[PDB]
Design a protein around this ligand. Structure first.
Ligand SMILES: CNC(=O)c1cc2ccc(F)cc2nc1C
Length: 165
């Protein structure tokens, strides 16, 4: 199972790890993708997860979008996890660089509650522009299921653990 995680609360754990490498080692039931409404996995966690699937995640996502249209900001969809997990929960956090509403971050984390255990990144963090300390706070105050957070950046990981209330 998951190893080397620091327990923050009854149900939230955190580790300084590359979510792609973490997904391949563990092969969780669910890996969370930091998706956009179009499921266009270009950069950040999305580009990295997609590149690990040899673009199979993007091909599957384009078929999903052609059939269903785009997701909502704060929404999600369950697709295959390919070589990384049983499933991939594509969650759309607000992108503050695209002027999207930060209040939608709680709605985005609510999607995690439909899954008993997940390997995930901090939503709206990184290239999405939100404050990662705020994202971790929303995560522990919203998610009730078991979440194993993978934080790529070592200096951000230290700042998050050392500042956690
Ligand atoms: C094998 N690793 C990767 O391909 C990789 C992983 C990342 C994970 C999170 C992130 F936000 C960025 C990452 N970037 C990359 C290139």
């Amino acid at each position: 199972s998951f190893s080397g995680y620091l327990k923050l609360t009854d149900n939230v754990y955190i580790k300084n790890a590359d979510i792609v490498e973490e997904a391949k080692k563990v092969k969780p039931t669910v890996v969370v993708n930091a998706a956009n409404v179009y499921l266009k996995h270009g950069g950040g966690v999305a580009g990295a997860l997609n590149k690990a699937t040899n673009n199979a995640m993007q091909v599957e996502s384009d078929d999903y979008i052609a059939t269903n249209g785009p997701l909502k900001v704060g929404g999600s969809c369950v697709l295959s996890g390919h070589n990384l997990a049983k499933h991939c929960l594509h969650v759309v956090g607000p992108n503050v660089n695209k002027g999207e509403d930060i209040q939608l971050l709680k709605s985005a984390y609510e999607n995690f509650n439909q899954h008993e255990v997940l390997l995930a990144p901090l939503l709206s963090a990184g290239i999405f522009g939100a404050d990662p300390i705020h994202s971790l706070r929303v995560c522990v105050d919203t998610v009730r299921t078991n979440v194993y957070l993978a934080v790529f950046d070592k200096n951000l990981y230290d700042k998050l653990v050392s500042s956690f209330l």
